[PDB]
Amino acid sequence: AVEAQEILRTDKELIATVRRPAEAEAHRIQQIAEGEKVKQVLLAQAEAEKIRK
Amino acid sequence: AEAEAASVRMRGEAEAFAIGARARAEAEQMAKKAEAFQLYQEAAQLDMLLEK
Predict the structure, then answer these.
(1) Phi, psi angles (nearest 5°) of residue B39
(2) Which residues contact residue B11 at a Cβ distance below 8 angstroms, ignoring those fewer than 6 apart?
(3) CA distance A47 to B4
(4) Neighbours of A47 (CB within 10 A)
(5) Which residue among B3, B7, B14 sits closest to A52, beta carbon to beta carbon?
(6) Which of A19, A23, A40, B11 has CB 3.0 to 4.6 Å from B3, enough for a Cys bridge?
(7) In a 3-state reduction of DSSP, which class is residue B39?
(8) Do residues B7 and A45 touch, judged by C-beta distance below 8 A?
(9) Is B13 in Cβ contact with A44 (below 8 Å)?
(10) Are the beta carbons of B3 and A37 separated by less than 8 Å?
(11) Cβ A51–B4 below 8 Å, yes or no?
């Protein structure tokens, strides 16, 4: 029974330790990727119209 | 990758339009060169030969 309670505790600990940080990291990566994509698109548009003019 | 592809597409389209712009300008430019050259006599050809 000691080890069964330890199983439950380590399940919850692994959740709080790696499962949620993984989701937070995924959200951070996708947010930063969105920012970088918008920045690159705007810079490319600026360069293209520079070349056109 | 989508951002890079859009960048390449837009920059290439802009530079191609610029190439077309100089193309039209140079064509309308050379038409008058030919028109002017049409009115050249022996004196003008002699001047060109002695300049070259």
Answers:
(1) -95, 55
(2) A44, A47, A48, A51
(3) 13
(4) 15
(5) B14
(6) A40
(7) coil
(8) no
(9) no
(10) yes
(11) no
